[PDB]
Ligand binder design. Structure first.
Ligand SMILES: CCCCCCCCCCCCCCCCCC(=O)OC[C@H](CO[C@@H]1O[C@H](CO[C@H]2O[C@H](CO)[C@H](O)[C@H](O)[C@H]2O)[C@H](O)[C@H](O)[C@H]1O)OC(=O)CCCCCCCCCCCCCCCCC
Ligand code: CLA
Ligand code: CLA
Ligand code: CLA
Ligand code: CLA
Ligand code: CLA
Ligand code: CLA
Ligand SMILES: CCCCCCCCCCCCCCCCCC(=O)OC[C@H](CO[C@@H]1O[C@H](CO)[C@H](O)[C@H](O)[C@H]1O)OC(=O)CCCCCCCCCCCCCCCCC
Ligand SMILES: CC1=C(/C=C/C(C)=C/C=C/C(C)=C\C=C/C=C(C)/C=C/C=C(C)/C=C/C2=C(C)CCCC2(C)C)C(C)(C)CCC1
Ligand SMILES: CC1=C(/C=C/C(C)=C/C=CC(/C)=C/C=C/C=C(C)/C=C/C=C(C)/C=C/C2=C(C)CCCC2(C)C)C(C)(C)CCC1
Ligand SMILES: CC1=C(C/C=C(\C)CCC[C@H](C)CCC[C@H](C)CCCC(C)C)C(=O)c2ccccc2C1=O
Ligand code: SF4
Ligand code: SF4
Lengths: 733, 97, 80, 66, 154, 42, 193
């Protein structure tokens, strides 16, 4: 106390600059803060959640305001396919005249940035048409963020702060979130789609001032309560329908076609409204499961404890798990992060193959940017989920209260899990690299026909089972008399089969041996990252090399050079080493996606098919080949609009490289160097009149690892983003 | 076909099933599962005032304890099945043998 | 100041005391082994956290454990 | 009446923080003196991470096995 | 055929690639003397290429649009020669190696200094042991059934 | 002679001789049946 | 004994009706699981025994096979037919709701028991003729019941697997085509096409 940080009395007495560093890097670790209690911790978490909501609302409001102010929305909606959306204007006093000339695009009056987040297509699809709508949305969101901050402050104050018993009421929270946060929210989204978006995609402009005077359907609500719901699907939009006009428009508000809109190459709006309504019904029904104050429903802990198999193969089953989950907040955070990462990767996988926003499938750079975005974020979320599982093992785990349940039995045979996962990783790596090197050597000797090209026959069979007819497997949906095919011929299969067999979209791309090899590389990456994380978690509480690790915290430098040396023995260090593998695996994923899509967008899928089988093909035909315009963004003969990326491309190369510093050179060298520097400064005239107030010291071991990893990751992300955006946008195809 | 007939019949039938057939089974199951509890104490006993069970409106004059909450539950089930019947019977969908 | 603990498994071999590079450990009278000796840590305020003592302990697991804690100018080994 | 396993016996370790936990060693000597909580001395054929092949254990930590 | 591929024997891009390879090889041959050592080597390589392509067509491999052979590993009996019988052969050889090494380790585990026989291989014993890998498929099976393949008490 | 045999069976020497023999065997097998991508005998 | 020469499970002595020591997977290891298994076995056996004659008898007459007799429900105008006459209340939603309600009520009433011997062998209203008088003669009747029930279960499995093998045919049709030419028309053609 008595100085920054006030939450740590041990740090505030550190006479070195370390106090500052560790002062910043532990501000949100409430559990390790002095004089910390239960209710204090929960209330702080609650207020921080409110702050995060306010920040999110403010950020999206800023996006809206800038697109409304320096954007291109009114012009973009006139011709979505032949005008580049504008993000925001550039006002940089460092720009030269040619830079100002090169950066003025999109019909603006000055240098501007071309948006690649895809907000234009998204806002267009939902119904926003003019700049006034964007301004109103921005104002509403500013109000919303202010209200979020007000709620946070209000619940900080006494007499409004919830007690701990309230925070741990899991049954009621689950009921409300399932039936309220999820169900009612999706019901409202379906309502908006029926009332605004669907009419907007047919010519009508329904707004606040007239939405009570317009019927969403000619026979509003008559069919709904009478039960004759089919009347809401009786007249769909014709296949010759321009999006925002009434030419070829229908009256159906709910349907289930399954295909794409022929003009926009995206999902039908009516199908989406129907989807949201359906899942809203499901969530509303399913959110009445647990018992609250009304004497009916379920108690979660009883369900858990009743699920114990006879025969004792699972020990005591799930007995005691309710209390270890409800009392351990790190367990909750790990589960939430795991599910969130899975569904973020699901979003990434579904957005490119089943686009929902109009004219986004034709915007190639936006699609690539969004996919890479969501995949990298999903990887980070998964790595974090495993990190917090390890943290739970260290901090909140009670061995005696979890005696012989699934968790304890997981801990007690950790070695079999780790060894078998290691075997899987070894197998995948050995054979994938062996096949790649074999093919590469084969092409080195000029004999491509001697390659080991394995057809991804199982994936092709699955694709055929979905209805694709390019492999001639003749399976469900691709046969003719199968019950599965015959059951849906009148609902969605027409459109679905029309879309899947169409070979200009990304709905189930044709696959070959290159896909087989790269998918096995993906599997190798997943298995090795899981190996590192699982080993770090299960061994967090201690191992043979350090049996008392649980008493040393989640993160610590080492245990000294004794017993052979104990570098990187913490669970934090296991997460640290797993981040590199996560980056590598997501890099392989995005390399594969981007190369396949850039070769498909050129009508040159063959080229990828030939050159993917060997690694030199990846190095030359993808990295070297697609990197000419980017590196030429500026040259001795001038610059163009891509220069900003060419600079960033180099910037990301520098950060990454300086990351190698903190990862290779370690503390002692730097400490001695800083000591001699301190001597020199103290021994010089006119500058010894200036005196430091915190003794300079080299970065901590853990801090140095963290800084090196941060540099590595920032450089990785920046260089790849520059490359991807410049190469896709350089060709715009 | 007649929405009122189907809805009323199905709801009354679901209420009959709840009141005369599955009544004792549900009561026994809710008795044995009990109130949700944290660290061995019920939610109210841990200091959560709002976790208190609403003992007022749960009691009924029915001979066996059929109260408001279960009329709501069984009527909701009846209406859900009734509207499923109506929508699916008027949908006109036909699978092919 | 780092926290140094001596556990009852100590056999009084004295090897940890020879190793400390700041004179933090000691030998004190005791009666639970043949040497009638056990290690003590009365001057942990001068401990630098080198963990050189643990590298010398022959028991398994260790009988002397160093837990790095709050850092001071003495614990950081700064001459300036 | 000596205490603990006999010299040259075959015991398995039950101390969970030991390198040879669940392992096996040969008893070398058990001190007859009371007031000593780790009398049993065991020798193993494998060194630990500190290159040590002998360690003392309490009576309950060792268990005579066949 | 399977996966939309066509047999290499009747495929066209396969033949085109064969012709192009031979043309490339012959291009170098015309530079040297008709019957010099380099010319003989190039002729031998051309004959090797022709034989290779003829054999690939003969065995009935599948060729894709690229004109290169593709291996089917789903288990189709028309392609067991591509992965399954080589797979069985590999499993036999690898189990031979592993069983022989395990037998050696178990045999030398009884000495006072087993490590001495590990950095300096006791060849006399190894030569006797290596031949157990002929019948390791039976030895391992009865080792498992008899219940002493896996170390109990662990 | 006896010590020559002993040193001639030490890990590095034995491994190099074993791998030289294996390499020669594989080289000869490839030479007799080169460009083999499948098992056609059965 | 279900296998001459194989040692018998400890918890299966041979006193229960139909106990022949068959339990390779050792599912009845826990006695409270074994009691539920016995009740479930008797229920399944009784259903199959009451069904198989129902699969065969109408087929023997001038009606369709067991799969054709339940295909009218897949049509927009599905209407049932019993003994060659159209029943009035044959439309699907009716039949469905009446069956669901009757079966649910009866099964719940059945399950509201904790004897647990009347759980499997209730008696009383279900033993009008009163065959359960002599305790040992009753035991041999139990043995016969379980034996015939297992036979009926096996027969039902055979009927279903035959239907899968030759779609659109009935057990009597399979028997007739087997009798027409025994040797060539057997299971072999199914096993080895
Ligand atoms: C065509 C249709 C007909 C086919 C008939 C096929 C028959 C099998 C093939 C060939 C048979 C003739 C082989 C040459 C004759 C001498 C083999 C022999 O008796 O040589 C003697 C050895 C001894 O066999 C056993 O060997 C085992 C291991 O002993 C020793 O093993 C080593 C032997 O050098 C070392 O001495 C080592 O210290 C010691 O452990 C046992 O413990 C016993 O000693 C002994 O019973 O046989 C060995 O396996 C020597 C290694 C070669 C064995 C080859 C078997 C086939 C594969
Ligand atoms: C090109 C860089 C590279 C490569 C090839 C590897 C490879 C590997 N890593 Mg690694 N890693 C790397 C970078 C790399 N890593 C970086 C930068 C980090 C951050 C510090 C990590 C951190 C890391 C961790 C924490 C872990 C791994 C693990 C592994 C192994 C996983 C098992 C496997 O896939 O089977 C084999 C994969 C291969 C590529 C085979 C390599 C051997 C081939 C066949 C060559 C054979 C030699 C050949 C005969 C030539 C000999 C020449 C002669 C002179 C001797 C694998 C060998 C995990 C592991 O150990 O697995 C259990 C593990 O936990 N890595
Ligand atoms: C939370 C979502 C939501 C909300 C707030 C609204 C709100 C509204 N809707 Mg709407 N609607 C929605 C979802 C939603 N709807 C969905 C998902 C569909 C597709 C089936 C429709 C289809 C629809 C039609 C066809 C019509 C409306 C109409 C209306 C307006 C009058 C409704 C009314 O009072 O009738 C009566 C309300 C009740 C009897 C209460 C229902 C019982 C509840 C569930 C309890 C009203 C402002 C009507 C209108 O004229 O718009 C101006 C109109 O005709 N809606
Ligand atoms: C809802 C998500 C969530 C939440 C609520 C938490 C919450 C928490 N985490 Mg966690 N984590 C998460 C996700 C989350 N995490 C994910 C996704 C990962 C995977 C990367 C991790 C990995 C992780 C680790 C390894 C650790 C935690 C720890 C913690 C605890 C202390 C954090 C702290 O105060 O340090 C202070 C905050 C910082 C030091 C952040 C500043 C440095 C960042 C990384 C730099 C940002 C990049 C850079 C500036 C951008 C480029 C700049 C420019 C060029 C554009 C805290 C309770 C720590 C802990 O003590 O556990 C108990 C711990 O060691 N987390
Ligand atoms: C791209 C990677 C990278 C970079 C940039 C550096 C940079 C540096 N290393 Mg180094 N190193 C690296 C990789 C790298 N290293 C790796 C991987 C290893 C492992 C072997 C090492 C191991 C190593 C050792 C052992 C040592 C160094 C040292 C140094 C420093 C030498 C002093 C100097 O050059 O003065 C000036 C700095 C630079 C020229 C770097 C770029 C500075 C830019 C041009 C200035 C930009 C200023 C700008 C206006 C800032 C405004 C931004 C604002 C928003 C904050 C220097 C900062 C030595 C040292 O510390 O010197 C005493 C030292 O002893 N390195
Ligand atoms: C998992 C990795 C992997 C795999 C599966 C293969 C597989 C194959 N390689 Mg290859 N290779 C690899 C890695 C790999 N390689 C790497 C990393 C390199 C670089 C050094 C090479 C370089 C290479 C070359 C130069 C050649 C091959 C060739 C071959 C094929 C020859 C088969 C053969 O020798 O006849 C059969 C061999 C046997 C039957 C021997 C076993 C019989 C025993 C001794 C007797 C058992 C009795 C019972 C085969 C399909 C050859 C080829 O022609 O490709 C088509 C060839 O020319 N490889
Ligand atoms: C669902 C039907 C059913 C059930 C519940 C039982 C239950 C029982 N049987 Mg019984 N049995 C059955 C059918 C059944 N049987 C049939 C059809 C036959 C003739 C083949 C027999 C022949 C038989 C004999 C000879 C004996 C028993 C015995 C027993 C009792 C002890 C065994 C045990 O505990 O395992 C419990 C069994 C189960 C939990 C059922 C297992 C279901 C699994 C999950 C799936 C089976 C897969 C199956 C092969 C699929 C075939 C599909 C088709 C395509 C071929 C137990 C109460 C023993 C006894 O003591 O009698 C009192 C005894 O000796 N049974
Ligand atoms: C073809 C590929 C499949 C091959 C399967 C081989 C047979 C596997 C079943 C028998 C396994 C077995 O008997 O050992 C089973 C092995 C141990 O093996 C058991 O050891 C016991 C103690 O020595 C007894 O000797 C038993 O006779 C012996 O079977 O354990 C297990 O694998 C667990 C499975 C359940 C038992
Ligand atoms: C008095 C009495 C009696 C009678 C009574 C009566 C008759 C009454 C009633 C009542 C009732 C009868 C009630 C009910 C119900 C309830 C409820 C509460 C419900 C519900 C439902 C819902 C809520 C739904 C919803 C929905 C939606 C909106 C969506 C879509 C559709 C659906 C359907 C899903 C008698 C004489 C017998 C005897 C004595 C006593
Ligand atoms: C460490 C730890 C942790 C965490 C961990 C994790 C996170 C893990 C994971 C994981 C995961 C993340 C997983 C996932 C998964 C998934 C799955 C398992 C699935 C599945 C399947 C299915 C069911 C399917 C189905 C289908 C359908 C429906 C149809 C179509 C086809 C398909 C097949 C798709 C915690 C903190 C908790 C605690 C401590 C420990
Ligand atoms: C360079 C280096 C140092 C010395 C690093 C020092 C002394 C840091 C000096 C950086 C100064 C303070 C300027 C840094 C500018 C930053 C961009 C400012 C960030 C501050 C906030 C914005 C977060 C170590 O102490 C070290 C320790 C262990 C392993 C590796 C290393 C290592 O590589
Ligand atoms: S860590 Fe180093 S300074 Fe501290 S007590 Fe041990 S030997 Fe002494
Ligand atoms: S080195 Fe270990 S055993 Fe020896 S005196 Fe110090 S603490 Fe005791």
């Amino acid at each position: 106390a008595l100085r920054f940080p006030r939450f740590s009395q041990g740090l505030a007495q550190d006479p070195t600059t370390r106090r500052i560093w560790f002062g910043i890097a532990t501000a949100h670790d409430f559990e390790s803060h002095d004089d910390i209690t239960e209710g204090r911790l929960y209330q702080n978490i609650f207020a921080s959640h409110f702050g995060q909501l306010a920040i999110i609302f403010l950020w999206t409001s800023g996006n809206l305001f800038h697109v409304a102010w320096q954007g291109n929305f009114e012009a973009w909606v006139q011709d979505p396919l032949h005008v580049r959306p504008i993000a925001h204007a550039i006002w940089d006093p460092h720009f030269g005249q040619p830079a100002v000339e090169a950066f003025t695009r999109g019909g603006a009056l000055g240098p501007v940035n071309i948006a690649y987040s895809g907000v234009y297509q998204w806002w267009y699809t939902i119904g926003l048409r003019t700049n006034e709508d964007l301004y109103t949305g921005a104002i509403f969101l500013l109000f919303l963020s202010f209200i979020s901050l007000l709620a946070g402050w209000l619940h900080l104050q006494p007499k409004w702060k919830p007690s701990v018993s309230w925070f741990k009421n899991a049954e009621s929270r689950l009921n409300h979130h399932l039936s309220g946060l999820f169900g009612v929210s999706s019901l409202a989204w379906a309502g908006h789609l029926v009332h605004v978006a669907i009419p907007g995609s047919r010519g009508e402009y329904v707004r606040w001032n007239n939405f009570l005077s317009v019927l969403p359907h000619p026979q509003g609500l008559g069919p709904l309560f009478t039960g004759q719901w089919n009347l809401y699907a009786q007249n769909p939009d014709s296949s010759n329908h321009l999006f925002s006009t009434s030419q070829g428009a229908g009256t159906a508000i709910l349907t289930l076609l399954g295909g794409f809109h022929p003009q926009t190459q995206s999902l039908w709006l009516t199908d989406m409204a129907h989807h949201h309504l359906a899942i809203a019904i499901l969530f509303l029904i399913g959110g009445h499961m647990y018992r609250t104050n009304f004497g009916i429903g379920h108690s979660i802990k009883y369900i858990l404890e009743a699920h114990i198999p006879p025969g004792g193969r699972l020990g005591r089953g799930h007995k005691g798990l309710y209390d270890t989950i409800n009392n351990s907040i790190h367990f909750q955070l790990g589960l939430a992060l795991a599910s969130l990462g899975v569904i973020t990767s699901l979003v990434a996988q579904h957005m490119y193959s089943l686009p929902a926003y109009a004219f986004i499938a034709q915007d190639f750079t936006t699609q690539a940017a969004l996919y890479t975005h969501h995949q990298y974020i999903a990887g980070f979320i998964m790595t974090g989920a495993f990190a917090h599982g390890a943290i739970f093992f260290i901090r909140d785990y009670n061995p005696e209260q979890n005696a012989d349940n699934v968790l304890a039995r997981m801990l007690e045979h950790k070695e079999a899990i780790i060894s078998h996962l290691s075997w899987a990783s070894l197998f995948l790596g050995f054979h994938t690299l062996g096949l790649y090197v074999h093919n590469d050597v084969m092409l080195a000797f000029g004999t491509p026909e001697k390659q080991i090209l394995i057809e991804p026959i199982f994936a092709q069979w699955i694709q055929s089972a979905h209805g694709k007819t390019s492999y001639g497997f003749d399976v469900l949906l691709s046969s003719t008399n199968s019950p599965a095919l015959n059951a849906g011929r009148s609902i969605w299969l027409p459109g679905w089969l029309n879309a899947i067999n169409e070979n200009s979209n990304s709905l189930f791309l044709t696959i070959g041996p290159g896909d087989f090899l790269v998918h096995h590389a993906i599997a190798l990456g997943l298995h090795t990252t899981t190996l590192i994380l699982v080993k770090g978690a299960l061994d967090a509480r201690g191992s043979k090399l350090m049996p008392d690790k649980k008493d040393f915290g989640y993160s610590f430098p080492c245990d000294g050079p004794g017993r052979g040396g104990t570098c990187d023995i913490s669970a934090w260090d296991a997460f640290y080493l797993a981040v590199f593998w996560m980056l590598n695996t997501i890099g392989w994923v995005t390399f594969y996606w981007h190369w396949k899509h850039i070769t498909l967008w050129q009508g040159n899928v063959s080229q990828f098919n030939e050159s993917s089988t060997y690694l030199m093909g990846w190095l030359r035909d993808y990295l070297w080949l697609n990197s000419s315009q980017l590196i030429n963004g500026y040259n001795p003969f001038g610059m163009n609009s891509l220069s900003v990326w060419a600079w960033m491309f180099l910037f990301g190369h520098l950060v990454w490289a300086t990351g190698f510093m903190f990862l290779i050179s370690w503390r002692g060298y730097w400490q001695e160097l800083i000591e001699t520097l301190a001597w020199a400064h103290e021994r010089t005239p006119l500058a010894n009149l200036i005196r430091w107030r915190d003794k300079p010291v080299a970065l901590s071991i853990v801090q140095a690892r963290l800084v090196g990893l941060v540099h590595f990751s920032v450089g990785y992300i920046f260089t790849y983003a520059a490359f991807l955006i410049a190469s896709t946008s350089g060709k715009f195809g | 076909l007649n929405p009122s007939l189907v809805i009323s019949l199905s709801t009354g039938l679901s209420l009959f099933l709840g009141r005369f057939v599955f009544f004792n089974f549900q009561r026994e199951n809710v008795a044995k599962q009990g109130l949700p509890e944290q660290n061995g104490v019920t939610h109210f006993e841990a200091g959560d005032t709002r976790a208190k069970e609403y003992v007022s409106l749960l009691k009924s004059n029915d001979p066996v304890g059929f109260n408001i909450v279960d009329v709501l539950a069984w009527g909701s089930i009846g209406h859900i099945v009734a509207y499923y019947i109506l929508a699916t019977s008027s949908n006109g969908y036909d699978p092919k043998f | 100041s780092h926290s140094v603990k001596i556990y009852d498994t100590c056999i009084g071999c004295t090897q940890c005391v020879r190793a400390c590079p700041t004179d933090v450990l000691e030998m004190i009278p005791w009666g639970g082994c043949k040497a009638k000796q056990i290690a003590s840590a009365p001057r942990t305020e001068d401990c630098v956290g080198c963990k050189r003592c643990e590298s010398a302990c022959p028991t398994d697991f260790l009988s002397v454990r160093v837990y790095l804690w709050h850092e001071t100018t003495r614990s950081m080994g700064l001459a300036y | 009446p000596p205490i603990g396993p006999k010299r040259g016996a075959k015991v398995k370790i039950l101390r969970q923080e030991s390198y040879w936990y669940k392992g096996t060693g040969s008893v070398v000597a058990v001190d007859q003196d009371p007031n000593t909580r780790y009398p049993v001395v065991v020798r193993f054929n494998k060194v630990n991470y500190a290159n040590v092949s002998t360690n003392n254990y309490a009576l309950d930590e060792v268990e005579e096995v066949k | 055929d399977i996966a939309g591929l066509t047999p290499c024997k009747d495929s066209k891009q396969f033949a085109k690639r064969e012709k192009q390879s031979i043309k490339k090889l012959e291009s170098s041959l015309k530079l040297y003397a008709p019957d010099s050592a380099p010319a003989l080597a190039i002729n031998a390589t051309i004959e090797k290429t022709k034989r290779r392509f003829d054999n690939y067509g003969k065995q009935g491999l599948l060729c894709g649009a690229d004109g290169l052979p593709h291996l089917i590993v789903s288990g189709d009996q028309r392609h067991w020669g591509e992965f399954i019988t080589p797979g069985i052969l590999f499993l036999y050889i690898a189990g031979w190696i592993g069983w022989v090494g395990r037998s050696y380790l178990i045999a030398i585990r009884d000495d006072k200094k087993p490590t001495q026989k590990e950095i300096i291989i006791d060849v006399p014993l190894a030569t006797g042991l290596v031949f157990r890998g002929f019948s390791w498929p039976i030895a391992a099976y009865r080792e498992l059934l008899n219940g002493e393949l896996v170390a109990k008490d662990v | 002679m006896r010590d020559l045999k002993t040193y001639l069976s030490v890990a590095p020497v034995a491994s190099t001789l074993w791998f030289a023999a294996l390499a020669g065997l594989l080289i000869e097998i490839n030479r007799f049946f080169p460009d083999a991508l499948t098992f056609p005998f059965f | 004994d279900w296998m001459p020469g194989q040692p018998r499970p400890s918890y299966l002595d041979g006193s229960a009706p139909g106990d022949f020591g068959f339990d390779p997977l050792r599912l009845g290891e826990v006695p409270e699981n074994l009691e539920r298994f016995k009740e479930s076995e008797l229920i399944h056996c009784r259903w199959a025994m009451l069904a198989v004659p129902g699969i065969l008898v109408p087929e023997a007459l001038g009606l369709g096979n067991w799969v054709k007799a339940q295909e009218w429900a897949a049509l927009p105008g599905g209407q049932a037919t019993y003994l060659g006459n159209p029943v009035p209340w044959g439309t699907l939603p009716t039949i469905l709701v009446i069956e669901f309600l009757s079966i649910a009520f009866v099964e719940h009433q059945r399950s509201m028991e904790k004897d647990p011997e009347k759980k499997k062998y209730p008696g009383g209203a279900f033993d009008p003729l009163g065959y359960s008088k002599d305790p040992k003669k009753f035991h041999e009747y139990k043995i016969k019941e379980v034996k015939n029930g297992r036979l009926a279960l096996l027969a039902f499995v055979g009927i279903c697997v035959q239907q899968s093998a030759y779609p659109g045919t009935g057990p009597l049709e399979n028997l007739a085509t087997h009798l027409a030419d025994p040797w060539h028309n057997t299971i072999g053609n199914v096993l080895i096409p």
